């Protein structure tokens, strides 16, 4: 594996539901890498993936790299109201020429930023009061073996 993930630090955690996701990514060592962040929600009859953002990085600097990946927040209107205040998942992945070779999964908890809202949640979700908590210390890493050059 020419490109290996060495570390991921979630920089702004916890944060507002609408704050961008900020990952400090460290990886080691001709075609561009593509870093992707994907929102994954599970409701009763539906498993839905929503790509939150992506960044093409290239030429790939060789050796040990450290950079920050800033991903746009989710669009709440594309998400069932049930998932806005529940446990969900984000997937941070990287692809080399469109074939994924590493995927880092994180649990995400979402809840209201005030005790009154947590105990008496309104009928309509107030996204501006939702705080997300990424379980950043326990990544679920999957690595895929793939050809480079």
């Amino acid at each position, epitope marked *: 594996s020419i490109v290996s*993930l060495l570390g991921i630090k979630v920089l702004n955690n916890p944060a507002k539901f609408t704050d961008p996701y900020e990952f400090e990514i460290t990886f080691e060592c001709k075609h561009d890498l593509e870093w992707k962040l994907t929102y994954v929600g599970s409701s*009763r009859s539906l*498993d839905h993936d929503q790509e939150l953002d992506s960044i093409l990085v290239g030429p790939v600097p060789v050796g040990v790299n450290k950079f920050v990946f800033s991903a746009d927040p989710p669009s709440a209107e594309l998400i069932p109201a049930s998932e806005l205040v529940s*446990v969900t998942v984000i997937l941070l992945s990287c692809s080399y020429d469109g074939r994924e070779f590493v995927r880092v999964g994180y649990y995400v908890n979402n809840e209201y930023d005030e005790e009154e809202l947590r105990e008496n949640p309104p009928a309509k979700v107030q996204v501006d009061h939702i705080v997300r908590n990424i379980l950043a210390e326990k*990544p679920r*890493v999957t690595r895929f073996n793939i050809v480079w050059d």
Partner: antibody
Amino acid sequence: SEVQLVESGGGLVQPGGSLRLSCAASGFNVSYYSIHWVRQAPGKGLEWVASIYPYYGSTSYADSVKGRFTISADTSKNTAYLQMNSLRAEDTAVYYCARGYGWALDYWGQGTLVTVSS
Amino acid sequence: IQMTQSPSSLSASVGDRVTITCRASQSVSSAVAWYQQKPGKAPKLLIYSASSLYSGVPSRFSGSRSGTDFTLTISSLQPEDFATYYCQQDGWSLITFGQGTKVEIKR
């Protein structure tokens, strides 16, 4: 390149005693993956006991072993460990170590038997 | 933080369609995996993320999720399939296994 996990260190220990299990990894770096210990009492089901996660070395433990067991990983020796203190009879089981595959476990060792008895 | 697996034992024949279910505590499909175990051997991974087939596993194995119910289906039971099967939930703080399903041969 062949991926293998080999447990060692099992055997007979008295109640209240300590025992250090080893999980020798080959074919991958033990620090780039989550490593887990899962035990199986004679004739019983699977019971997870401990996990360690990459990058930070954060750990998770089942309630029945919290405090008594400590999981760790040494990158130079490419080996993970399960330090078991204050052992009890109910800790008798075959102990497997396994490698994390996302939220799952893709490679498992052969398991090492731990018997706690006087 | 609980997995209730059923049935606990099932007798079937080669070629049968077998359905094993686990009711989980959460509906996150990423967190659920299915394993097969034979006596004196380590468990083997069959299904991960509720419905993804692990490499090398035959296509007669499949997994699904309905609410908090997770189901493993074997479409055409083969002689090497008679074994015990376990579901797993890798939760926020604890990893939980189902009690297991022992699939035996009817005769």
